[PDB]
Design an enzyme around this catalytic site. Structure first.
Site, short mmCIF file in Angstrom:
data_model
loop_
_atom_site.label_atom_id
_atom_site.label_comp_id
_atom_site.label_asym_id
_atom_site.label_seq_id
_atom_site.Cartn_x
_atom_site.Cartn_y
_atom_site.Cartn_z
N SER A 220 -1.66 -9.64 19.52
CA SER A 220 -1.83 -8.23 19.90
C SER A 220 -2.38 -7.42 18.72
O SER A 220 -3.47 -7.70 18.26
CB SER A 220 -0.50 -7.72 20.46
OG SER A 220 -0.71 -6.55 21.22
N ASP A 243 -4.11 -12.93 22.37
CA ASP A 243 -4.23 -11.66 23.09
C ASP A 243 -4.49 -10.47 22.19
O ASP A 243 -3.74 -9.50 22.15
CB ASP A 243 -2.96 -11.43 23.94
CG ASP A 243 -3.25 -11.30 25.41
OD1 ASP A 243 -4.40 -11.53 25.87
OD2 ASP A 243 -2.28 -11.00 26.15
N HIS A 298 1.11 -10.52 28.62
CA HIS A 298 1.03 -10.30 27.16
C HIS A 298 2.23 -10.85 26.39
O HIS A 298 2.10 -11.34 25.25
CB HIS A 298 0.93 -8.80 26.89
CG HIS A 298 0.39 -8.38 25.55
ND1 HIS A 298 -0.76 -8.93 25.02
CD2 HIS A 298 0.79 -7.46 24.66
CE1 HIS A 298 -1.04 -8.38 23.85
NE2 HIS A 298 -0.09 -7.45 23.59
#
Length: 372
Positions: A220, A243, A298
């Site tokens: 992330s 991600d 996620h």
């Protein structure tokens, strides 16, 4: 605990390292191949203030903090706390960067799996106020007494987001490079006094690193941190962005990343404005690969995907349609295959080279987001 044990043949140890003791020093959790396997006793979230910070991150009240603590405050992750390092081999090194609202202990499923395959993993705790919580010491005497100063996540105004997220990613990249320099300096004998008083002797790390075989991995915000770090520090030989959230990155970075880069995405997180930035990284003179894990969310890359049951986790978006162990196994195996290829490892991780190409019932080559 339902955080999975690593699948590789090495036993896994865990410890924490803080040096120097200040808010500008390095703080990391280390996962490493251990000589022995005597008990899986590492505490997953080691301090009450991390739960308080998670509650603030979530926008919830006082009450959520204490509740999380009651549910998870004694949960372990499957590593031997402070176990000796397995001697007689130099290990490749991963520096790992956490997402927004996380902190260094929440990616143990990944860290432990890598260590079980013969890596040392340094999961940094960032001091950019992107962690839900972190701590440091105001002087050496405070470090000796365990007198911690806590720093909690900074919430931003919209007019703040562009400038502050970019300042944070640059600080994060600096923290990854600083962590790498600390480990390399210890490897070559720098005397370090850990600001934390723990039964792991850091002198064990002398001559333990394969210094040519270093990678950066992150989730992330941590996936943007991979890209910023590679751009600045060629000691990192490849990166794996889990991600990635690409918003924090400046336009200059896209052309300045010589190293191989692997994007492993969740199916349900990605969106065109983000994917187009990943696509900006592609060039025929560079190695860039992308896969998407079908049915994942996620949170499949972080440890809270293992914290709850199937139905509540799905409702809380901690779990996707795919089984969490199946998803983390695909991410970990593809990562190992990529690491073997671009670090030049002499292992058998090339058995999973097919996953780098997306060739599995639970993978998509590239992305579902066809934008360019």
């Amino acid at each position: 605990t339902k955080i999975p044990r690593g699948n590789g043949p090495y036993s896994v140890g865990c410890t924490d390292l803080m040096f120097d003791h200040t808010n500008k020093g390095t703080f990391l959790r280390l996962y490493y191949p251990s000589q022995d396997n005597d008990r899986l006793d590492t505490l997953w979230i080691p301090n009450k203030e991390y739960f308080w910070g998670l509650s603030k991150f979530l926008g919830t009240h006082w009450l959520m903090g204490n509740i999380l603590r009651l549910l998870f405050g004694s949960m372990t992750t499957p590593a031997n706390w402070n176990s000796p390092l397995r001697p007689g081999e130099k290990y490749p090194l991963v520096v790992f960067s956490h997402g927004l609202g996380a902190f260094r202990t929440l990616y143990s499923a990944i860290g432990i799996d890598l260590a079980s395959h013969g890596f040392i993993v340094a999961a940094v705790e960032h001091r950019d106020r992107s962690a839900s919580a972190t701590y440091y010491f105001k002087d050496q005497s405070a470090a000796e007494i365990g007198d911690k100063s806590w720093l909690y996540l900074r919430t931003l105004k919209q007019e703040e987001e562009t400038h502050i997220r970019n300042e944070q990613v640059r600080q994060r990249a600096k923290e990854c490079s600083q962590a790498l320099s600390l480990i390399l300096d210890i490897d070559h004998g720098k005397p370090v006094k850990n600001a934390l008083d723990l039964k792991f002797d850091m002198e064990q790390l002398k001559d333990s690193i394969d210094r040519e075989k270093i990678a950066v991995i992150g989730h992330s915000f941590g996936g943007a941190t991979v890209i910023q770090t590679l751009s600045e520090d060629q000691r990192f030989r490849c990166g794996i962005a889990l991600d990635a959230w690409m918003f924090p990155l400046g336009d200059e970075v896209y052309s300045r990343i010589p190293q191989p880069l692997f994007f492993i995405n969740s199916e349900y997180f990605q969106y065109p404005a983000n994917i187009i930035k990943m696509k900006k990284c592609y060039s025929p003179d560079k190695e860039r690969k992308m896969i998407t894990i079908r049915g994942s969310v996620h949170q499949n890359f972080a440890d809270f995907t293992f914290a709850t049951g199937k139905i509540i986790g799905h409702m809380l978006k901690l779990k996707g349609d795919i089984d969490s162990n199946v998803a983390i196994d695909l991410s970990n195996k593809a990562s190992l295959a990529f690491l073997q290829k671009h670090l030049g490892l002499h292992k058998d991780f090339d058995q999973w080279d097919c996953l780098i190409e997306g060739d599995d019932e639970n993978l998509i080559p590239g992305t579902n987001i066809n934008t360019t």
